[PDB]
Design an enzyme around this catalytic site. Sequence first.
Site, PDB file in Angstrom:
ATOM      1  N   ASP A  96      -0.097   7.784  -2.128  1.00 52.30           N
ATOM      2  CA  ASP A  96       1.288   7.412  -2.042  1.00 52.30           C
ATOM      3  C   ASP A  96       1.923   7.591  -3.404  1.00 52.30           C
ATOM      4  O   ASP A  96       1.414   7.087  -4.396  1.00 52.30           O
ATOM      5  CB  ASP A  96       1.404   5.972  -1.587  1.00 52.30           C
ATOM      6  CG  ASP A  96       2.603   5.756  -0.740  1.00 52.30           C
ATOM      7  OD1 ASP A  96       3.716   5.911  -1.282  1.00 52.30           O
ATOM      8  OD2 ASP A  96       2.435   5.454   0.460  1.00 52.30           O
ATOM      9  N   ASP A 198       7.324   8.335  -1.385  1.00 48.15           N
ATOM     10  CA  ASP A 198       8.069   7.125  -1.043  1.00 48.15           C
ATOM     11  C   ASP A 198       9.569   7.266  -1.326  1.00 48.15           C
ATOM     12  O   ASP A 198       9.966   7.660  -2.437  1.00 48.15           O
ATOM     13  CB  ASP A 198       7.448   5.972  -1.847  1.00 48.15           C
ATOM     14  CG  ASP A 198       8.078   4.625  -1.556  1.00 48.15           C
ATOM     15  OD1 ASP A 198       7.822   4.066  -0.470  1.00 48.15           O
ATOM     16  OD2 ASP A 198       8.791   4.102  -2.445  1.00 48.15           O
ATOM     17  N   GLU A 249       8.827  10.485   2.712  1.00 49.96           N
ATOM     18  CA  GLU A 249       9.383   9.372   3.466  1.00 49.96           C
ATOM     19  C   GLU A 249      10.877   9.262   3.174  1.00 49.96           C
ATOM     20  O   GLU A 249      11.285   9.063   2.031  1.00 49.96           O
ATOM     21  CB  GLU A 249       8.675   8.063   3.127  1.00 49.96           C
ATOM     22  CG  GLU A 249       9.200   6.871   3.904  1.00 49.96           C
ATOM     23  CD  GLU A 249       9.271   5.611   3.058  1.00 49.96           C
ATOM     24  OE1 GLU A 249       9.622   4.539   3.603  1.00 49.96           O
ATOM     25  OE2 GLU A 249       8.979   5.692   1.848  1.00 49.96           O
ATOM     26  N   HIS A 323       2.652  -0.127   7.639  1.00 52.63           N
ATOM     27  CA  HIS A 323       2.317  -1.473   7.166  1.00 52.63           C
ATOM     28  C   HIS A 323       3.536  -2.380   7.217  1.00 52.63           C
ATOM     29  O   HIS A 323       3.412  -3.589   7.036  1.00 52.63           O
ATOM     30  CB  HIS A 323       1.787  -1.432   5.728  1.00 52.63           C
ATOM     31  CG  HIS A 323       2.771  -0.875   4.752  1.00 52.63           C
ATOM     32  ND1 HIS A 323       3.763  -1.642   4.177  1.00 52.63           N
ATOM     33  CD2 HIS A 323       2.954   0.385   4.291  1.00 52.63           C
ATOM     34  CE1 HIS A 323       4.501  -0.884   3.386  1.00 52.63           C
ATOM     35  NE2 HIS A 323       4.031   0.350   3.439  1.00 52.63           N
ATOM     36  N   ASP A 324       4.700  -1.784   7.478  1.00 53.92           N
ATOM     37  CA  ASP A 324       6.002  -2.455   7.493  1.00 53.92           C
ATOM     38  C   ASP A 324       6.590  -2.667   8.879  1.00 53.92           C
ATOM     39  O   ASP A 324       7.642  -3.306   9.017  1.00 53.92           O
ATOM     40  CB  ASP A 324       7.014  -1.587   6.755  1.00 53.92           C
ATOM     41  CG  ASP A 324       7.099  -1.926   5.300  1.00 53.92           C
ATOM     42  OD1 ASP A 324       6.857  -3.113   4.977  1.00 53.92           O
ATOM     43  OD2 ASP A 324       7.391  -1.011   4.488  1.00 53.92           O
TER      44      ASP A 324
END
Length: 555
Positions: A96, A198, A249, A323-324
């Site tokens: 990431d 990200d 993302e 994860h969110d």
Amino acid sequence: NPWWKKAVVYQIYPKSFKDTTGNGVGDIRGIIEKLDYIKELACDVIWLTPIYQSPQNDNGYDISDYYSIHEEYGTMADFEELLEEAHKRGIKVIMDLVVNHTSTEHRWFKEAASGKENLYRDFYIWKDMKPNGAPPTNWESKFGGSAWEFHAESGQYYLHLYDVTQADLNWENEAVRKKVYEMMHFWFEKGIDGFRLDVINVISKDQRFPDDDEGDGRRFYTDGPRVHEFLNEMNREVFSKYDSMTVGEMSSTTIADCIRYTNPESRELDMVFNFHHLKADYPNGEKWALADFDFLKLKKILSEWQTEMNKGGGWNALFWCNHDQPRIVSRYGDDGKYRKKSAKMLATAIHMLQGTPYIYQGEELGMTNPKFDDISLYRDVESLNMYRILKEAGKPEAEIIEILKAKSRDNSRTPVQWNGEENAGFTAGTPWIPVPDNYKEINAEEALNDPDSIFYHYKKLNELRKEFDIITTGDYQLILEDDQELYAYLRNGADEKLLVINNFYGKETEFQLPDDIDIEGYDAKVLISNDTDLPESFKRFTVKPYQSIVYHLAK
Ligand SMILES: [Mg+2]
């Protein structure tokens, strides 16, 4: 054809994957121990969320040093052994990459904040108070409140689109870019196979910093004037030198931009995530409000992204989970009676689309939201805050709890359930976050010993993508657009089609192939199904609750 086109990626959130030390926190050695499991699933890429040195003010997305690993997760030696054990099994590893901002604990920020003349001052984004005492703009941080934080000692505000200790890097500064690239080279030369970038589409800010009437200011930094330029430069300097896979993302992006980001001619990114299909149960765009999903809107969203990217030459990253986000079987499936069937249906629905699929740890087990029924079981600061506020506003306890059960960002962060032993075998200690009691029925050991398990359904989908080229090359054609229960579509190839039929609900309903679907002279065979109750004829039949079938049609 690039190695990433037919890849399936397994997303790992290391804190909750496998604890080998007994401190209740997952670690890199835990991932190593699970490589055979990940290979058995037939994934061939592993993606790790941030493991860099960080104060952990924001779940690892506030990075204080990009060159080292959070000690809790292990050593750099562990990491290199993970790369080596992965590659030996034919599994690639992507990391990431968080370069819109750094922790305010980063060496560069500590230097920059010290004064207006420090060398690194322009590494971040600083502006003066307005004459009326207002912040430099009326832009809002995504954590709420002003996006500008006053720094007393130097006399200016620095920008944070996200949390307060996450200071936005100044991408207008060529010095910053070069430092980021050097850092990227360090990791690639270490042997990683790529990066997920990200919130990468917010790095280009409007340099006139105007105020936003109609909004929160996002109109002035989302897919901004220079994003394509920056990404392409990043491609020329870094990505073009390695056999890499890059996935961006995107925050609040558009189809037009994502085509540009991912069309191979642009030499920017290989694929992108967008989140519109994961906002289909938000009433009036309110992220914390309860509602049922809008099925027709969901179908419309998925189909737009399929056909437009296909026509434009772009590539979608395909996923349901993060994860969110809530765990998908609880969210769009049925986590009661039809937990297994609906988990398989959701897997088929998205895997038979055009793009590269991502599996989030535990999704292959049909792990559900944990249904924590007490505030002491939660960990996410946003959830604790939300409970505090709603309690103060006089909402009853059970109603607040209902909201947290649907929306808490802890929900997909509970530990991966490996077996039916203490704490689902995740830890020999006390896990940082509780394991729900379903673990005895929902775990990997149980799934791996049940031929009809969700795990083997994902394995088959993963292997199908390697075996049947039409899954990669076929177009997409939505049918039954208005149907209230069925999501069905075709993938059209050269004298070869797929017909995919998914019941998104728990009632029987009829499927009838539309008249305009020209399948004259085609023979049908079942490619994959979550039900042995197969129709006599696919042309018209009664679909069972949560039934999912894919037919392979050939001449
Ligand atoms: Mg540990």
